[PDB]
Ligand binder design. Structure first.
Ligand code: ATP
Ligand code: ATP
Ligand code: MG
Ligand code: MG
Lengths: 552, 538
């Protein structure tokens, strides 16, 4: 339970004031026409003002706690390694971040105030009973801890049940998200019924768990009521027998039982709180696992040199994906990218080219060998610096639901001027169609970028890469959707632009006509480099590259 | 709201049982005070062990019965509420799937999922936490009401008189409260959308190193939500303070009347009046709170009854389809951005057994033609005919069984290779899925997978190479044996040798093929070539 209370350490200076107000109000409650009328009005006004101030302070503190907890959980989620987001799907993570925290905060805010109020009132009633009689109240205090044994034994049930409820809800949310996205694919195969059946199958588990929750709630209500009744009746019985012997007084016992009535009511409420606390502990297991998780990736470095060449060296690099470590995807790659040159990486599908592009972006760490940028490992550079010096397009580019101005300038720390965005769009070839839009660069695109065509989206993705002026540029099949005219832009960018001397380019494509002018060509098959050299050198070899070109 | 009660109609027996248990609990609670009074009276003078044990016995008996009935009541209400929640989710999600494709560009998927997750709880959760204590106090409150009615009927009527400003304050509070709740839900939906976009495309975010920017955006949304929460809480507290002040005014009015008036009973009558008034005010507050909670979820009810912008469904399902497709003066503009035509007066005929190639620059409207062929959008002028009948007059399942397309950027779903091939088929044998995998040349890489045809394809196909995903899309198309096949750049990701091997699309000569491409290699063997420039045929 200490994990839940750990997050409240930043609000003690306010919760102590709230406690002072509530105890003062509790003590105040426990303890000629003009004269009698004024006093009641003053008392009521004082009580109302005190209650108002206490409620305001408590609500403000709880809202701050909720916001801070949600922000911390999301920030902890974003720090995890790359393969963490393949084990956990988007809907699951979204449900954990946005729903579990809200439920935990709601439970905490609803139960803490009730606990404190009834605890203070019970203490006051206990003091009054101490005044009334010492022996009988000592008997009550002796028999009181016996009531909490049943809750202690049962409590683990609520945790284990609530965990399952949360998991089922997250699975249903994942199904709903994955169905609602990519709706044209569902529509074009008439599969709405299948998606509905999936969602219903996920709802059935929640229904089954809800039945158990209802039964447990009824049983707990029975147990609490019987415990209160037994506690009251035992004291009543012992008192009714003690009075006969004459060792006590009738009026004192009457007053003692009259207050014992209320003390048992407070005890019943405090017994009711415990299962809710167990439920809350159960519901927050996954988010606290997220918070306390240790990322399995090296942290950011410190280097941010003013001068960087863009010299990249692969030294016997081999890699295997963490979700399937038994199979090596790359085996002993050894090649160098130098500024002012274009290196082409070609081969069949599934050979590992995009894996090489992902390694070069520090998304994954090699299982063997070294991968150096200007003689130093990638993890030694600072994050936002390294990802400005190295930029990539991606095989199927993804854009965000913002304006075209923000999509191009995405990720930059300082906002570039519109003159720079226009230059980047001109160089990428996307300036032609953006100027035709009624809103120009302020046009908002949908979250999937579906309002653009494929070639337009690819041109926007290329402009997004160029604006940073990277020293290492990675073109992962950036020519796939571009038409005949737009390929000339890429050709000029690669081989004729005056800025080509400042950067090294890694060109990955299946369009081998673009490769003829490359300084070096690497043929990758089965995860290993087979041939290397220029276009003419590979042509004279009559090997794999020559066979691939002469396929038609 | 009467609509929600109609939605709750299947749960009526549980509500009836809960009402019966509530009646039993109240009837049992009527007896415990009687015997408790005897216990107190016998303890306080005139001690007699014979009566004492009897009184304690009856007290225990009726406390036990009331406890059991109360527990059953609470269980029944809890289960009913949860079942209503699940039914709301089921119907909302079923309604969303029916909508026209323009609906999903106006809305955002993270907001829709936030609606499903959050707004249903507001409408489902009618009952407060401590309602059992409130119900258990009912008999005591009624007994206190009995005392003050007999002690002084006049001042009881004065208490029954409503405050001058009580009505207006409650109406103003409810009107403000409902709006605040609606705004809170909108802000929550926006924050959920922010998280959805940040998490879904995380590889790009990490590639550009923009995690901190997303964190800042989410924190800003959280700050807005916090401000709305604080406003709601502050308004509620102020309303409670004003209500207490009005009750105080009514209180001394009758204190004045009582002092005008039978001696020494004012000390006891005031307490009973205060308690009864507080209880009735709490009941009215609960009713208004439930009403406002149901009112705040209006957008869920809006999505549950929106009729989609689609033509009425189509009866036709022929036993044989010739597969002739005709465009007749087709003009189209997207519904979200009208007055900007995309296609202008297209007209062409596709015949079975012949391959047609459609070419053009970027943004010409080729994928728009592919979408109109599949009846995903309706033309704003002219007609689209299949077998000399409108495309929209065919049955949904039959139409998307005969007419099949391979998208520009294929989307797969989390699940096996068997479920991505044969997606949307009711039943499909092991043999047809292997034959379709062989036809698309996908079988070579499927053996190298750890679990063959049963291997988990990751979310959105993220655990496959681009060409492998493309081949699984081709196999998903071919397993149906379509009469009309549409290929929207199906060979973009494939290497030259696989691209060459897949050129013979209709070697049997029994189906209509439409090929959309930029490379001239795949358009030289076509019988008919259509050039599309700026939405017009050249
Ligand atoms: N997340 C992943 N987990 C496991 N294996 C993966 C994952 N992503 C890709 N692979 C596998 O890694 C291998 C290389 O894939 P990659 O996309 O790097 O190849 P490629 O040569 O770029 O292919 P293409 O030319 O089709 O783009 C393939 O066998 C692929 O299935
Ligand atoms: N959902 C949409 N809402 C509005 N406009 C859209 C939408 N989808 C596409 N468009 C626009 O319609 C036009 C035609 O796009 P379409 O994808 O049909 O062209 P295309 O010739 O297939 O392009 P490409 O060769 O790049 O694949 C473009 O201007 C595009 O921006
Ligand atoms: Mg690739
Ligand atoms: Mg297209």
């Amino acid at each position: 339970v200490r994990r839940l209370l750990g997050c409240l350490g930043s609000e003690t200076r306010r919760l102590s004031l709230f406690l002072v107000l509530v105890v003062l109000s509790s003590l105040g409650e426990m303890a000629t026409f003009t004269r009698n009328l004024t006093l009641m009005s003053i008392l009521t006004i004082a009580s109302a003002v005190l209650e108002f101030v206490g409620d305001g302070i408590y609500n403000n503190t709880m809202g701050h706690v909720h916001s801070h907890l949600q922000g911390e959980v999301f920030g902890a989620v974003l720090r995890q390694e790359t393969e963490f987001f393949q084990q956990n799907q988007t809907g699951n993570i979204m449900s954990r971040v946005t729903e579990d925290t809200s439920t935990l905060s709601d439970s905490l805010s609803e139960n803490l105030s009730l606990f404190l109020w009834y605890l203070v009132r019970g203490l006051c009633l206990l003091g009054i009973m101490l005044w009334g009689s010492v022996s009988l109240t000592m008997v009550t205090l002796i028999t009181l801890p016996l009531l909490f044994l049943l809750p202690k034994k049962v409590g683990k049930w609520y945790q284990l049940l609530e965990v399952q409820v949360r998991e089922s809800l997250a699975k249903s949310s994942q199904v709903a998200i994955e169905a609602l996205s990519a709706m044209p694919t569902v529509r074009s195969f008439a599969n709405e019924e299948g998606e509905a059946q999936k969602f219903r199958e996920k709802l059935q588990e929640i229904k089954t768990l809800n039945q158990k929750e209802a039964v447990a709630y009824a049983v707990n209500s029975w147990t609490t009521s019987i415990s209160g009744m037994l506690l009251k009746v035992g004291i009543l019985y012992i008192g009714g027998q003690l009075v006969t012997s004459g060792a006590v007084s009738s009026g004192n016992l009457v007053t003692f039982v009259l207050y014992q009535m209320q003390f048992t009511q407070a005890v019943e409420v405090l017994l009711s709180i415990y299962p809710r606390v167990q439920k809350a502990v159960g519901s927050s297991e996954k988010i606290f696992e997220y918070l306390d998780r240790t990322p399995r990736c090296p942290p950011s470095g410190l280097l941010t040199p003013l001068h960087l060449e863009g010299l990249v060296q692969f030294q016997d690099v081999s890699f295997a994906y963490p979700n399937r470590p038994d199979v090596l995807v790359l085996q002993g790659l050894t090649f160098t990218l130098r500024p002012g040159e274009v290196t082409a990486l070609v081969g069949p599908n599934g050979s590992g080219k995009s894996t090489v592009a992902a390694l070069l972006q520090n998304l994954y760490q090699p299982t063997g060998g070294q991968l150096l940028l200007d003689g130093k490992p990638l993890p030694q550079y600072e994050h936002r610096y390294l990802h400005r010096q190295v930029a990539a397009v991606g095989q199927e580019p993804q854009v965000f639901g913002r304006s075209l101005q923000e999509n191009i300038a995405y990720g930059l720390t300082q906002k570039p001027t519109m003159e720079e965005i226009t230059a980047a769009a001109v160089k990428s070839g996307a300036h032609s169609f953006i100027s035709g839009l009624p809103q120009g660069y302020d046009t908002e695109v949908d979250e999937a970028g579906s309002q653009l065509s494929g070639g337009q989206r690819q041109a926007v993705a290329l402009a997004r890469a160029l604006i940073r002026k990277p020293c290492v540029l990675i073109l992962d099949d950036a020519t796939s959707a571009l038409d005949a005219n737009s390929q000339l832009q890429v050709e000029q960018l690669l081989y004729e632009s005056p800025e080509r001397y400042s950067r090294s380019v890694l060109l990955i494509t299946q369009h081998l006509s673009l490769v003829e002018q490359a300084d070096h060509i690497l043929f990758l098959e089965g995860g290993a480099i087979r041939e290397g050299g220029t276009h003419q050198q590979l042509m004279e070899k009559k090997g794999c590259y020559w066979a691939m070109v002469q396929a038609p | 709201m009467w609509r929600l009660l109609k939605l709750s109609r299947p749960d009526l027996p549980l509500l009836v049982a809960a009402f019966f248990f509530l009646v039993l609990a109240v009837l049992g609670e009527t007896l415990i005070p009687h015997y408790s009074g005897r216990v107190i009276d016998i303890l306080g003078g005139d001690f007699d062990p014979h009566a004492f044990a009897s009184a304690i016995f009856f007290m225990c008996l009726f406390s036990f019965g009331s406890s059991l009935s109360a527990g059953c009541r609470g269980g029944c209400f809890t289960y009913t509420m949860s079942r209503i929640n699940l039914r709301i989710r089921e119907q909302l999600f079923s309604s969303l799937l029916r909508q026209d494709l323009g609906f999903f560009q106006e809305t955002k998927t993270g907001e829709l999922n936030s609606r499903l997750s959050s707004d249903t709880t507001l409408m489902s959760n009618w009952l407060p936490l401590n309602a059992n204590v409130l119900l258990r106090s009912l008999v005591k409150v009624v007994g206190l009401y009995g005392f003050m009615l007999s002690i002084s009927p006049r001042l009881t009527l004065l208490s029954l008189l409503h405050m001058p400003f009580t009505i207006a304050a409650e109406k103003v509070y409810n009107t403000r409260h409902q709006e605040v709740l609606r705004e809170i839900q909108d802000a929550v939906a926006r924050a959920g959308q922010v998280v959805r976009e940040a998490v879904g495309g995380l590889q790009t975010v990490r590639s550009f190193g923009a995690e901190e920017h997303e964190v800042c955006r989410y924190k800003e949304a959280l700050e807005q939500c916090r401000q709305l929460y604080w406003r709601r809480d502050l308004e509620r507290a102020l309303y409670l303070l004003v209500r207490r002040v009005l009750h105080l005014g009514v209180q001394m009015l009758m204190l004045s009347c009582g002092l005008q008036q039978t001696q020494g009973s004012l000390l006891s009558f005031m307490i009973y009046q205060e308690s009864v008034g507080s209880y009735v005010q709490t009941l009215v507050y609960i009713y208004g709170d439930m009403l406002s909670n149901v009112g705040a979820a209006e957008k869920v009810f809006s999505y549950m009854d929106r009729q989609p912008n689609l033509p009425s469904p189509g009866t036709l399902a022929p036993t044989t389809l010739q597969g002739v497709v005709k465009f007749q003066d087709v003009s189209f503009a997207y519904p979200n951005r009208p007055d900007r035509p995309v296609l202008k007066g297209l007209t062409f005929t596709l015949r079975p057994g012949e391959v047609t190639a459609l070419v053009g620059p970027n943004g010409s409207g080729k994928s728009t033609v592919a979408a109109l062929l599949q009846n995903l959008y309706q033309p704003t002028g002219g007609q689209v005919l299949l077998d000399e009948k409108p495309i929209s007059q065919y049955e949904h399942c039959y139409l998307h069984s005969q007419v099949v397309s391979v998208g520009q950027e294929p989307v797969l779903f989390s699940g096996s290779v068997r479920n991505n091939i044969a997606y949307g088929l009711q039943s499909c044998e092991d043999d047809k899925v292997m034959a379709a995998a062989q036809a698309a040349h996908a079988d070579d890489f499927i053996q190298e997978m750890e679990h063959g045809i049963y291997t988990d394809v990751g979310e959105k196909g993220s655990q496959l190479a681009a060409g492998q995903k493309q081949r699984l899309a081709i196999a998903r198309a071919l397993v149906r044996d379509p009469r009309v096949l549409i290929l929207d750049q199906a060979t973009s990701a494939l290497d030259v040798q696989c691209e060459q091997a897949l050129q013979d699309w209709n070697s049997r000569g029994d189906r209509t093929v439409l090929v959309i491409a930029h490379r001239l290699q795949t358009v030289q063997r076509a019988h008919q070539i259509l050039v599309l420039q700026e939405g017009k045929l050249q």
